[PDB]
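Hmm, how's this folded?
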Amino acid sequence: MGHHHHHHSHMIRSRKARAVYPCEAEHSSELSFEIGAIFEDVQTSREPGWLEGTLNGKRGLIPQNYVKLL
C-alpha cells in the first residue's frame, strides 16, 4: 500500500469535503455539523445547491457553500 486513491485526474465519486461554515440544520435529512467536519463520498444532490455525503455514519443534505472539497 503506497498509492492514494484520491488523485487530481479523478474527483468523480469518493470525494472529501471539510465544513468551512457550521450547519445547524432543523430537518432529519439535513446533516448538522460544525467547522472541520470531514464528509466521505461527497456527491451532488437532487436538491439545488445541496450535496450528499457521509458524516459519523450518516448521509444527508449538506450545504455546498458550507463545505470545501479537499
